[PDB]
Amino acid sequence: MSDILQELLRVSEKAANIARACRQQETLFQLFAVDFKTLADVLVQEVIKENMENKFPGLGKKIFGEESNELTNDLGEKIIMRLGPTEEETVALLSKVLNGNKLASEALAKVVHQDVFFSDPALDSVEINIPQDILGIWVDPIDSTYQYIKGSADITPNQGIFPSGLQCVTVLIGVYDIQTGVPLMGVINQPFVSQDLHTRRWKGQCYWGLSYLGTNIHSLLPPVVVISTSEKETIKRIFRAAGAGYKSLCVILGLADIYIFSEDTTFKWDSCAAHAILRAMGGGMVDLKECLELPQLVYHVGNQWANKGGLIAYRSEKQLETFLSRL
Ligand SMILES: [Gd]
Ligand SMILES: [Gd]
C-alpha cells in the first residue's frame, strides 16, 4: 500500500491547507445557524474521500469517518456535500450552504481544487502492494476542534508537550484490515507546528507508518516515566494535553511514554491512524478496562464506534509492563 500511503500524504497536506486557509483568509476567518466548524470538517473529509476514489477506483466506499457527508443550512435544507468536478460546481454548492456568501464560497473552492505535490522520497523507494479489497479507512478530518476554533498561537509547551494551542490540532487518516480489524497504515498531519512571528504563516509536519505482514516502516523521527492525559481526565510525571490525535503523537515522538484515557469518548477514527504508526515501531494501543482485569484495539467491529473501556497507548511494551505494574 506504499502507493496508497504516498497518495494519503498528499491529501493530508491538502487537508492541512484547507485547515490553515480557514484561519488565515480574511473572509473565512470571520465565520440552528451557519455552523462553520461542521462545514470545515465535512468538506475536508469529502476532499480526502473524493481524491482517493479518483486515484484508486473502489476505495471511496471504504472511507469512513467522524463526519457525515450531509449538512443542514440556515433554511433547514439538507445538502449532500458532493464537490466538483469543476471549481464552478463547488462554488454553487458552498453558496447553498452559506446563504449566498460568494467571497467565502470562492475562497474555499480555490483551496479545495488546489494541486498539491507533497512526496516523501523515502517512501518512493519502498514498493509494497496490499490488495485493495481488504482495506478500510477511518478519517478524523480535523481533530481537537475546540483548540482549532479558539486558535491560540501563543502557548509555551511544558517539556515539549503543548497543553493547548493550534499545535494540538491533527488531521488523522488510518487504514485497517477489514477481516482482522488490525490497523495497517497511518498518516498524522499537524497543520500548525511553527509560526513565523513576522509573516504569520504556519508550517506543518507529517508522520506516517506501515505495518503489513511483518514489514514495519515509519517516517524519520526528529530527536529532542512520562504520562500524557486529557484536559478532562479524572482517573487516579503527568501532563495535561488537548487532542486525542496529538497525545498519541506525543507517544510516537517519544515526548510521553504513556497516553492513558479512561472514558468511552474516543472513537475508532481518533486512534486508528496513530495505532498503525505505533504498531510500526513495536508499540500499540490496549483496552484500558481489560488490562485492569495484551489485547489490542480493533477497527472492523462495532460495539457504536467508541473505544469502550478507554485506552493505553505505548511505544514500548517494556514501558507498558513497567507502568501496568506500578498501577
Ligand atoms: Gd467534527
Ligand atoms: Gd476527534
CA distance 310 to 284: 14
CA distance 184 to 257: 22
CA distance 305 to 283: 22
Give the SS3 label for residue 200.
coil
Packing angle of the helix pair 244-253, 268-279 (nearest 10 deg): 10
The CATH architecture one would assign to domain 222-327 is 3-Layer(aba) Sandwich (3.40)
Q: Name every residue whose Cβ is closer than 8 Å to that of residue 221 and which is 6 or more positions away in sequence.
A: 252, 253, 254
- CA 141 / ligand 2 centre spacing (Å): 8
Each domain of the chain, given as residue ranges in start order, spans 1-67+115-221, 68-114, 222-327
Count the alpha carbons within 13 Å of 42 in the hemisphere toward its beta carbon: 18
- Output phi, psi for 217, to 5 deg: -135, 150
Packing angle of the helix pair 87-97, 102-112 (nearest 10 deg): 130
Give the SS3 label for residue 10.
helix
Position of cell 513565523? 196
Give the SS3 label for residue 313.
strand
> Do residues 107 and 21 lie in contact, with contact meaning Cβ atoms separated by under 8 Å?
yes
> Do residues 188 and 274 lie in contact, with contact meaning Cβ atoms separated by under 8 Å?
yes
CA distance 285 to 231: 20
The dihedral built from the CA positions of residue 158, 163, 164 and 167, taken in this order, carries a sign that is positive
* Beta-ladder partners of 202: 195
Give binding residues for Mg(2+) as ranges. 66, 140, 142, 270
Alpha-carbon Rg of the chain, whole angstroms? 19
CATH code of the domain occupying 68-114: 4.10.460.10
Give the SS3 label for residue 155.
coil
The CATH architecture one would assign to domain 1-67+115-221 is 2-Layer Sandwich (3.30)
Give the SS3 label for residue 59.
helix
DSSP letter assigned to residue 296: B
Spell out a b/e string for 220-240, using b for 16 or more CB atoms within 10 Å of the CB, else e. eeeeeebbbbbeeeeeeeebe
* Beta-ladder partners of 195: 202
**Ion ligand 1: residue ranges with CB closer than 5 A:** 41
| Annotated catalytic residue 41 | yes
For residue 282, give the C-alpha cell: 513495536
Would 1-67+115-221 and 222-327 be classified into the same CATH topology? Answer: no
